[PDB]
From Swiss-Prot:
Example of a GO biological process term: secondary metabolite biosynthetic process
Organism in which the protein naturally occurs: Brevibacillus parabrevis
Cellular component aspect of the GO annotation: cytoplasm
Domain of life: Bacteria
GART as annotated region, ranges: 3-145
Record text about domains: Two module-bearing peptide synthase with a C-terminal epimerization domain, which is probably inactive. Each module incorporates one amino acid into the peptide product and can be further subdivided into domains responsible for substrate adenylation, thiolation, condensation (not for the initiation module), and epimerization (optional). At the N-terminus, contains a N-formyltransferase domain that is probably responsible for the formylation of the first incorporated amino acid.
Job description of the protein: Activates valine (or leucine, but much less frequently), and then glycine and catalyzes the formation of the peptide bond in the first step of peptide synthesis. This enzyme may also play a role in N-formylation of the first amino acid residue in the synthesized dipeptide.
Keywords carried by this UniProt record: Antibiotic biosynthesis, Ligase, Multifunctional enzyme, Phosphopantetheine, Phosphoprotein, Repeat
Similarity annotation: Belongs to the ATP-dependent AMP-binding enzyme family.
Manner of cofactor binding, per the entry note: Binds 2 phosphopantetheines covalently.
Cofactor(s) listed: pantetheine 4'-phosphate
Modified residues (O-(pantetheine 4'-phosphoryl)serine): S716
Name used for this protein in its record: Linear gramicidin synthase subunit A
Amino acid sequence: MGRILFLTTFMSKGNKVVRYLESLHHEVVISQEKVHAQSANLQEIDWIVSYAYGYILDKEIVSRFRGRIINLHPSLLPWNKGRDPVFWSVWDETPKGVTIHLIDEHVDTGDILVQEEIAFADEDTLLDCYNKANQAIEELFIREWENIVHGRIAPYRQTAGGTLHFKADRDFYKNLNMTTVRELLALKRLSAEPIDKTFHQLFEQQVEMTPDHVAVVDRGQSLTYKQLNERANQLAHHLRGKGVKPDDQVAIMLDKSLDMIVSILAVMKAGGAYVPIDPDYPGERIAYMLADSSAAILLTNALHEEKANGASDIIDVHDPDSYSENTNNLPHVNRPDDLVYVMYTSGSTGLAKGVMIEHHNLVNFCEWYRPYFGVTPADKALVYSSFSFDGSALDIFTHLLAGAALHIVPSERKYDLDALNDYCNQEGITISYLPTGAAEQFMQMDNQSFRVVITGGDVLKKIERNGTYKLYNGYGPTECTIMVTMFEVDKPYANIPIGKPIDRTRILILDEALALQPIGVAGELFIVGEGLGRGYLNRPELTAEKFIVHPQTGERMYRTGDRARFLPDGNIEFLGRLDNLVKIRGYRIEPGEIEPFLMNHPLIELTTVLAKEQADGRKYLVGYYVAPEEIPHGELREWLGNDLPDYMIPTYFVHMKAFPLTANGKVDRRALPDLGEDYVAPTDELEQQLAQVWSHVLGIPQMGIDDHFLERGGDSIKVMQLIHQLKNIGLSLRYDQLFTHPTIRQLKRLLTEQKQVSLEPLRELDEQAEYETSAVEKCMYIIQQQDVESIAYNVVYTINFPLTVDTEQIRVALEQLVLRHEGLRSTYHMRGDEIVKRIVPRAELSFVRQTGEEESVQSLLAEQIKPFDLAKAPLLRAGVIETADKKVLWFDSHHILLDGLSKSILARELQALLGQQVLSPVEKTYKSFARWQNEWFASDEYEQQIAYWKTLLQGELPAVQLPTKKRPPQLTFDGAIQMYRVNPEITRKLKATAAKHDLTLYMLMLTIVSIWLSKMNSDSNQVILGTVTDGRQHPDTRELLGMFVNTLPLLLSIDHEESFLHNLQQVKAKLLPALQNQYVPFDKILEAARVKREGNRHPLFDVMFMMQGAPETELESNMHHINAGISKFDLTLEVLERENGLNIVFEYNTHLFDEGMILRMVAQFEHLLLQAVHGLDQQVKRFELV
Ligand SMILES: Nc1ncnc2c1ncn2[C@@H]1O[C@H](COP(=O)(O)CP(=O)(O)OP(=O)(O)O)[C@@H](O)[C@H]1O
Ligand SMILES: *P(=O)(O)OCC(C)(C)[C@@H](O)C(=O)NCCC(=O)NCCNC(C)=O
Ligand SMILES: CC(C)[C@H](N)C(=O)O
């Protein structure tokens, strides 16, 4: 007995505890709003129970309810006070539990009533942890409420300690809610957070260690560490006497030589930063670098003095008057934050940018380099790269701090890989950095000298090399000091990783909102740590855009513009530039993904795929490959056709003896040479007549005669369009005939007779008070009347919009769609015998506006999912839930109106309206199709279709009996969901395999499902499973809203003695007749099998398999189907094509399968699918489930 005030997040939050309190005869008042000190909520209140409440109570209310305010907080206080306690308990690795406590003047600090610990498994997602913690604290309350009111609980004080978090603290981590505990802590180690020496301080130290060792070697001219230091001191004294101060730039224009090394060190010791200028650069680049730089002094000699055009003061390094007699180390004037050098990135003059690197950047890299590669003074290093390229900083600075010797590559032998190898073998060169392009050609040479070869700068593809040296792949932008990650290439990889970060460096993968990405999810690569340079010279606005302060973490980081993702082992995978993404026939492609498939060819050693644009603007791919002899164009398409769909196969192929290289040793992509070769223009009146129809169905211009219909985007839907468009020219073609003759050259043989030319449009009906319903509408109506409160046939979708979209523009667009489509203004009524349809001229759309937290969205949607009265229009409800970061549009509909294709139409028209576009009126109406089809049921064509099912469904029908629990006594619909993602690479292989063997992706997946079912049913030779078709019988219905879908049983045979490919063809043979006779209402198919809708099982099949194609619009691709805890069948498998992969959803009945069984079945499906794709000619009996 009492009166309790329940303050919680939303209406249904804490259902169990309210029901328990009410069962004890307490009166509960639920509220989520703020409580005023004087209000109706407060008067006559015994207890106040709060659970995830969103507001703080006034000091006066906490006073008037001393010892009467109980709070349910899902953490082990004092750990994780405040917001998101479960998440922070996992991320911070704190003790875990739930606490019921009193509310005091000080928040989340009142005396504990009861506390208990809780455990989270490694494989649980953060969402499961959240729900588990809530369940535990609610059960704890129910268990102890009696021992609270009666006073059996003695409160005790919280210990001082723990943690605290606020609302916005979680913003950076918003993408992590579906990641497991193990995966979250792995990410934490990779994401969560001193040098006080300059480089010349470290070099001067290295000299005192090895003063007599060789430092530099140039054509028999030698210089020891002590000689090098003294000469540098001589020039440095003079330079500082000329006014060299810290952060001052000094230009150097010299050829690789002893003087270059002496000049670089002299500028450091003097106190300034050097700006290297390669004398071999074009004149305009030299002039640009000298102008953009603030250097007033230039070190050069006579041969290059003229190239400067007298732009600054010149100091001749050959003149003895530039060297002071003093050879003593200068006194230090440099801080580690002072510039050490400035190097320019690629680009035209004015675009190219000067990158400012600081002493501490360089020291950090050199200290990591020496131990990582084990550099001892006995090592011989090569100075290969131009000294205007930061690859030379690697060559020079890392080895001078390890006592090793630098060897000045002689000009006549850098671009001759053969002589270079000879110089390295003869001289004993052990370590060197070679850019990717040059390194891949150096691998051919027989070398015995090198211990380690480091490459980088471009995508490394070849690793087969003659030699015993270790191969390393390094990555990094000039902006972050040479390299930030390193990887030891140990074996072949389709994509060679770029490795793990170096000392005091972290790599973050962020999304477009700068939010952390889970491990394995691709995003933009950001860099944090000691490698970040100062920025771009004379360019503060560009610096602020690329060197950002993160708005949540406050940390400084560099936006690289590269795409990448972490691998499970901590290594990183480069995925290309974010700009190089090009679209071809409506597919976002990374051309780099095609190359490794050309590499696998036995006769190809190097390859590079590019994107180009014709004068028209059309995109098209070209493939360059290196091989001894030219490979036929056809043999290449067939080779690539094993793993890639046609849109990723280059239109052209170019054979070359070798790739040209740039100065920096990268492949010169701009220097490669500049309707495909397999086109066979039509030469016939019929040939040309079909090449035009195919072009319109496939949406491709200038179609050829040897072009395979499926390889170029054809599917079941587009095969229907082809047939109906050939009936437009009196040419009759059947469904199965297209798959035997999938090209115009072959198909033309069967198109001679020009009869059966019946052009019949769908006819509009005269106005009537009432209209006839279709066959499927009658079935749906009768089902709904069996339980009018059931939501099992509601259809719920959501769409995430940005906060910048206007809620009211969305409402208006939906209201216009109610006006556009009579389906949204249709009602259903039972007039004695018949089920009848009425149409209203106008209908009012229910549109609800709400606000809430992201964590509450699904709970708020579930409260809105209610039955539809089929006699009332519109059969659609909608609303918008605004959170802190987005607006979630939801709409609920009934299956009698919205089917799969109807959703696609609704999404396309909604996208147009939000874009301020005008739509042409809808020409046909569903009610006219219903009258046309009801009459078609009296024709002879219908008699023949039903005759197919009478024959097939006679007698012995297989019984697929999966291992379940004891079935309930009647039909249940309680369901849950599990998901399996097939990545793009495997999805492409599946797609390529299907087309190559005259199969659709659907036929290929249906066969895998059938083998899967068979394996679970004691390798049964036959299986039965349902599927669905769009059911758009009349071609004038493809833009209407309504229910057209028809259900079909499939009797399939699996021959475990035959190969996968053989079973694939046998599934096609059984599917096509079923599609040819698909237009019989499912109720008549149940008659033909003498089965009725009764019992605890669904009549003909327990397993349903359905599949949808890729989305037609950006909006549709952002639509998510929400399951309301319903399972129409024992088990449904749905395959959706999303983001170049397959999302496979297993919807199952919870009374028949528990989570343990489903998790095993999903694991077995994946394993079976991977064996199939890789084992086409393998016998099915050799595929195993575990
Ligand atoms: N191992 C590696 N693998 C793949 N790409 C790499 C790589 N190492 C470096 N890169 C790429 O090269 C870029 C940095 O090259 P930098 O020389 O520092 C500027 P750049 O000279 O203007 O390059 P550019 O001429 O290719 O445009 C990186 O962003 C990355 O895209
Ligand atoms: P082909 O490419 O082998 O496809 C065969 C199908 C799938 C039978 C094809 O004819 C077809 O009917 N595609 C549309 C199927 C469809 O509508 N799936 C979604 C139905 N789902 C809902 C919720 O309505
Ligand atoms: C090693 C260095 C040259 C770096 N990888 C770059 O490409 O700029």
